[PDB]
Design a protein around this ligand. Sequence first.
Ligand SMILES: CCCCC/C=C\C/C=C\CCCCCCCC(=O)O
Lengths: 49, 49
Amino acid sequence: SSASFSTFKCYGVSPTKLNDLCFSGVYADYFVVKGDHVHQIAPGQTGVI
Amino acid sequence: SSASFSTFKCYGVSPTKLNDLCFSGVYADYFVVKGDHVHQIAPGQTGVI
Ligand SMILES: CCCCC/C=C\C/C=C\CCCCCCCC(=O)O
């Protein structure tokens, strides 16, 4: 596809193990920000967003 | 030089001790990727590269 991810980061699970796991529930939240506000989307951060 | 490094990150080594160390063997791998693929060159990652 044409996604071309620049940032991909996970907590509580390691990326090399996702192919061997089963989940009981998954949710997906989606929105649009600007480039300087991307680092703000993380647990334990501060700022306007 | 004209390298102008943008990513310099080391594992199993502190940058401030590189001048006081002696090594039994050193290998160097080199190649070309694109800008959004640079973060994939690290242990324990996923992606196409
Ligand atoms: C002149 C400073 C005097 C006060 C210093 C001490 C307290 C305040 C410290 C930090 C202020 C951070 C600014 C807001 C940053 C938001 C996050 C971001 O934008 O990503």
